[PDB]
Amino acid sequence: EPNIFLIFSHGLQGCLEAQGGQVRVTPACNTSLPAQRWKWVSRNRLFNLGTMQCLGTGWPGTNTTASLGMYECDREALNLRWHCRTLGDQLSLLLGARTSNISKPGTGQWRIYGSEEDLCALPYHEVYTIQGNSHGKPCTIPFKYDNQWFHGCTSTGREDGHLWCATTQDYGKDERWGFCPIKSNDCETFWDKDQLTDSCYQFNFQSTLSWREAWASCEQQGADLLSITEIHEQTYINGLLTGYSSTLWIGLNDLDTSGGWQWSDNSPLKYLNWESDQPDNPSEENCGVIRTESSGGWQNRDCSIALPYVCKKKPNARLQAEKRSWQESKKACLRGGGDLVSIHSMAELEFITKQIKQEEELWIGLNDLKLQMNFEWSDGSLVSFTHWHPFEPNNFRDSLEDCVTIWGPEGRWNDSPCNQSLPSICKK
Ligand SMILES: *[C@@H]1O[C@H](CO)[C@@H](O)[C@H](O)[C@H]1NC(C)=O
Ligand SMILES: [Ca+2]
Ligand SMILES: [Ca+2]
Ligand SMILES: [Ca+2]
């Protein structure tokens, strides 16, 4: 089982254990004894596998030094809260010393046993539930189910093998639960597969999660937040979304470089379904959504609001200085046997940055002339890479800017009116 560890004291040469109603260091360390096996769980609690309880100290009426004890993990009136960085020091401190220990005949770092990592090595990570009745809320670890404590996900209580967790600490009381995410290359359960491609989709209509939690939820399933890379993809999504009413997080965000738009996965931004007046509120709303209200259009929203979200996975997978309009800046490339330049890589971008361009604006082969905000190279190559300018493409004011420039020093692009007279670059 992952994330279970023994706690080894170098000073006292032994492992922490819980047994017989005591907490103590035993010189015989055994990785297979439940009394010696610990796990970090939620709310900074340290769970013992053999006792099924959490390490703590009390609040007695006698206001005096504390000692270690084991407690039912739902008793949060007590001090059940530790911190992995200071835990070793506090174990030593609270273990104390008997007079026998400091008066012997003849006149201490703690670590995971084995690997010898620090006690922060195996932190607890929240696990967002899938479907269930909990709207995606993380597992409550540990939880009680049929009078037993579980320190992780379990198939107990189900016949179908699917691992699940409670989303409170007592399922019998509350009956709130969800499935645990699984990493797999199959799309059969909790997924839908586009059969025309390798893509699998999960529309979690009933979940309410922040964009970051939704990102993590898709990550824990071996997937990523939806990226819409192609008119084909937006078409499938629109078909699937017909008849629903929902607003869902997708992988689009400007978070890193303000205004720089990107998929959370690495897909190029060659396709934009922004709604009419969106993006608005640039410093405010940093994360994209898709909405049925707009027949599949995209808005940006404050990333902390709780929304449903879509997960996706694909398991089976020289210059011309003469100023002219973009249009037949291409004609000048075609005659001469070439085409306006396409860029498939950041190196090919830098290949062209200082070398060919040599200090300002100029045309490349990227254009949306055929379908608005679906960008293609004029030389017909795959659009596998894009370097845009924050807020671009735009269509400044409401006006068609159907052709792309290199405006700026470092090679980032912009969509501008195709009749602006500018230099160009060709390739063959
Ligand atoms: C750990 O306990 C098992 C009994 O379950 C025993 O067979 C084994 O030898 C023990 N390991 C050590 C190092 O004492
Ligand atoms: Ca908005
Ligand atoms: Ca355009
Ligand atoms: Ca523009």
Side-chain angles (χ1 to χ4, degrees):
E1 196 184 344
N3 298 316
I4 314 295
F5 51 105
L6 271 55
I7 297 166
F8 186 72
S9 162
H10 273 297
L12 317 145
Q13 197 71 20
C15 295
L16 196 70
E17 70 158 353
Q19 182 73 61
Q22 268 106 38
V23 176
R24 47 159 180 253
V25 180
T26 177
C29 284
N30 202 324
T31 69
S32 53
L33 283 176
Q36 301 183 25
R37 289 167 68 75
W38 303 85
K39 180 168 182 184
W40 285 113
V41 292
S42 65
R43 299 201 294 262
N44 294 135
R45 284 175 296 164
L46 190 56
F47 185 85
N48 181 261
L49 269 70
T51 217
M52 278 148 74
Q53 290 181 327
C54 292
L55 181 79
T57 78
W59 303 101
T62 50
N63 187 3
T64 196
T65 65
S67 48
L68 297 175
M70 295 308 308
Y71 302 93
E72 288 297 297
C73 293
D74 46 12
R75 299 182 52 188
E76 228 120 20
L78 308 181
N79 169 41
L80 311 183
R81 180 169 306 263
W82 308 87
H83 316 263
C84 60
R85 196 252 315 172
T86 68
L87 173 67
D89 298 335
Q90 267 170 8
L91 291 183
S92 286
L93 193 51
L94 304 166
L95 284 171
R98 305 184 294 124
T99 291
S100 277
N101 302 125
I102 63 181
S103 181
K104 293 183 150 212
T107 80
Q109 290 290 319
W110 303 68
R111 305 287 158 83
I112 293 90
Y113 185 86
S115 81
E116 294 287 295
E117 206 91 43
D118 74 323
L119 300 170
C120 293
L122 311 175
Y124 172 77
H125 294 129
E126 287 200 331
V127 158
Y128 303 94
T129 47
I130 304 292
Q131 299 197 1
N133 63 9
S134 304
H135 307 290
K137 151 169 193 205
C139 296
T140 298
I141 306 292
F143 56 91
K144 186 180 301 185
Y145 170 75
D146 193 36
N147 292 313
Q148 310 188 314
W149 283 104
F150 290 82
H151 49 272
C153 297
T154 179
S155 79
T156 290
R158 309 191 54 86
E159 315 305 304
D160 58 6
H162 297 135
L163 300 163
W164 69 278
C165 60
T167 61
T168 74
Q169 56 193 346
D170 185 15
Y171 178 81
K173 193 174 167 278
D174 297 308
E175 275 162 57
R176 299 285 164 187
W177 67 286
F179 294 105
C180 301
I182 44 167
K183 295 180 185 202
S184 65
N185 64 332
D186 21 73
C187 299
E188 66 285 78
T189 76
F190 311 114
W191 291 93
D192 292 304
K193 185 178 186 174
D194 183 18
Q195 207 56 244
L196 286 156
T197 197
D198 286 326
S199 292
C200 298
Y201 298 97
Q202 175 186 92
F203 283 75
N204 303 293
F205 289 109
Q206 317 294 329
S207 297
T208 56
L209 292 188
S210 82
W211 190 96
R212 289 189 160 81
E213 300 166 318
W215 186 89
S217 176
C218 299
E219 194 278 334
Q220 298 156 357
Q221 309 183 80
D224 211 322
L225 277 167
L226 169 71
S227 67
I228 307 170
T229 77
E230 226 176 8
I231 185 94
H232 163 91
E233 196 161 27
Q234 180 75 50
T235 299
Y236 181 86
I237 303 319
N238 279 354
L240 179 159
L241 275 172
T242 34
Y244 298 89
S245 172
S246 185
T247 300
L248 308 105
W249 288 128
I250 52 176
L252 193 51
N253 76 101
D254 59 9
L255 292 152
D256 280 337
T257 294
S258 169
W261 292 113
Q262 57 186 41
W263 298 110
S264 72
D265 79 5
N266 264 294
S267 299
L269 187 76
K270 62 178 251 57
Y271 176 75
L272 292 83
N273 214 19
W274 287 122
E275 278 172 24
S276 64
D277 267 272
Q278 302 254 359
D280 63 347
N281 292 118
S283 184
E284 315 297 333
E285 295 173 325
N286 301 17
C287 293
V289 301
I290 185 170
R291 56 149 86 262
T292 60
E293 174 169 342
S294 72
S295 292
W298 313 345
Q299 297 181 356
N300 63 339
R301 294 284 249 281
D302 173 26
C303 304
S304 62
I305 71 184
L307 291 164
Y309 59 104
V310 196
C311 302
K312 165 170 169 195
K313 75 195 167 167
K314 294 185 280 184
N316 277 4
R318 79 139 215 284
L319 174 67
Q320 299 179 147
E322 344 83 48
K323 300 185 191 299
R324 281 179 317 278
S325 71
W326 181 100
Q327 235 75 18
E328 298 340 312
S329 294
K330 194 190 91 190
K331 251 191 210 151
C333 293
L334 305 165
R335 74 188 184 258
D339 211 334
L340 264 159
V341 61
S342 65
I343 318 169
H344 297 206
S345 57
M346 179 72 187
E348 190 189 6
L349 177 62
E350 298 300 286
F351 204 139
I352 303 180
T353 47
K354 178 56 176 175
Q355 167 189 146
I356 308 186
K357 161 184 163 290
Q358 190 48 241
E359 299 172 86
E360 184 62 26
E361 276 205 295
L362 50 82
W363 294 120
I364 57 192
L366 211 70
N367 71 101
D368 64 30
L369 290 163
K370 185 181 71 188
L371 206 189
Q372 266 295 316
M373 292 291 182
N374 183 65
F375 284 98
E376 308 174 340
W377 293 111
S378 48
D379 72 13
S381 71
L382 288 171
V383 193
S384 317
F385 164 87
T386 60
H387 203 242
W388 286 111
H389 174 66
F391 295 88
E392 307 285 0
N394 63 352
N395 287 339
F396 223 136
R397 206 57 60 203
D398 231 81
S399 67
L400 309 161
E401 301 187 321
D402 294 343
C403 295
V404 181
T405 65
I406 308 232
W407 157 321
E410 78 216 39
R412 103 286 184 286
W413 312 337
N414 169 26
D415 67 323
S416 50
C418 294
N419 64 336
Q420 179 183 350
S421 197
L422 295 164
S424 71
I425 301 189
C426 315
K427 147 158 97 84
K428 64 180 174 185

